[PDB]
Design a protein around this ligand. Structure first.
Ligand SMILES: [Ca+2]
Length: 367
């Protein structure tokens, strides 16, 4: 029938606390305290109602935050795909901290799975995986990966509320089949899929392009303006990815305030198939990086508060792609989120600074 699985998310905002996967987690765990990091987020950011954390390592579908798998011994494919037993408890501990605090949990999962190991330089893992699905699944990589992912999905069952599926153009097999696996475990999961970005066009089909962000922008590269669309029958919320950072689009682009966010709140729910409805959701990097804590901090309180208010007032949702520094939210971001949360829990909520086009910011079409 008709489904609004993300109805709980409408009018809410979230933060991100990624956990490392596989051998990367074994390398970072000795200097990290993700559990303390999660307690600090709970204490300091009560206004955020959910968190995105990690099934796979960021941009590395072959590296998992859990080890044990009742469906396949992943450690026997290649040990570097999975962390130690001691370290697999980090993700579970973080999730339980958020559950006790009443925060919903969405897990980032890079859809490519082990198929992308060589893309990140992990050639030994790639060879082991390729040998595994060839010999054990008679060359059916799609079934091999669904089986493997299912064994972790089952462990997270009832502990998490949704999934954010990255890199779905590179999923072995079909998205429909992978989402069906997820829903076979828990059909109420709130699921986003990142296929490709869509962009604002004019009445004759040309893309809109930002020409400048301000007076003497350091990066003059023209960039397109992301539009969040409901493009398939599987999704419960739009993935929310900004215009790619590599194209020189700042994650706090003024154009997101003139186009992207207004469009999110103009029509906060849309349907592709006529039965399942999906919620408009944006995922904004707070730095000039999705996951890199050392990148330039791009938002300040006043702009970040206006992003949260404009989205949530409209009945849409947004997540900050905050970063982790030894398991804690990077401290400059934490400082901002404290202030945002404190404003968002006041009644009345304090007014946000009104949006004005930055001096010397223009579209190519406006010149
Ligand atoms: Ca572009």
């Amino acid at each position: 029938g008709i489904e609004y699985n993300a109805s709980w998310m409408a009018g809410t905002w979230g933060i991100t606390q990624r956990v490392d996967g596989g051998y990367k987690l074994d390398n970072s765990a000795d200097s990290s305290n993700w559990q303390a990091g999660a307690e600090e987020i709970v204490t300091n950011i009560p206004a955020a109602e959910y968190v995105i954390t990690s099934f796979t390592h960021p941009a590395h579908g072959h590296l998992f935050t859990l080890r044990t798998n009742n469906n396949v011994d992943v450690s026997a494919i290649h040990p570097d795909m999975v962390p130690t037993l001691e370290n697999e408890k980090i993700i579970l501990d973080v999730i339980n901290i958020y559950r006790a605090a009443g925060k919903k949990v969405i897990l980032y999962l890079n859809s490519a799975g082990p198929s992308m190991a060589e893309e990140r330089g992990d050639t030994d893992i790639q060879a082991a995986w390729d040998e595994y699905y060839i010999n054990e699944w008679d060359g059916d990589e799609a079934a091999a990966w669904r089986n493997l992912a299912r064994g972790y999905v089952e462990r997270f069952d009832g502990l998490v509320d949704g999934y954010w599926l990255d890199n779905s153009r590179n999923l072995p097999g079909e998205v429909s089949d992978f989402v069906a696996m997820l829903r076979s475990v828990d059909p109420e999961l709130t699921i986003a899929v990142n296929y490709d970005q869509h962009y604002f066009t004019d009445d004759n089909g040309e893309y809109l392009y930002v020409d400048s962000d301000g007076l003497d922008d350091e990066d003059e590269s023209d960039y397109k303006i992301v539009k969040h669309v409901v493009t398939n029958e599987y999704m419960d919320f739009t993935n929310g990815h900004v215009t790619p950072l590599g194209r020189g689009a700042p994650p706090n682009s003024w154009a997101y305030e003139e186009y992207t966010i207004p469009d999110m709140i103009e029509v906060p729910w849309e349907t592709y198939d006529g039965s399942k409805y999906a919620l408009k959701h944006g995922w904004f990097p707070i730095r000039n990086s999705w996951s890199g804590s050392k990148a330039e901090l791009m938002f300040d309180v006043e702009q970040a508060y206006r992003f949260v208010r404009t989205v949530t007032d409209g009945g849409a949702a947004m997540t900050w792609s905050t970063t982790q520094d030894n398991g804690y939210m990077t401290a400059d971001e934490m400082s901002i989120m404290i202030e945002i949360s404190n404003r968002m829990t006041q009644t009345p909520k304090p007014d946000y600074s009104v949006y004005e086009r930055p001096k010397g910011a223009y579209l190519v079409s406006e010149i």
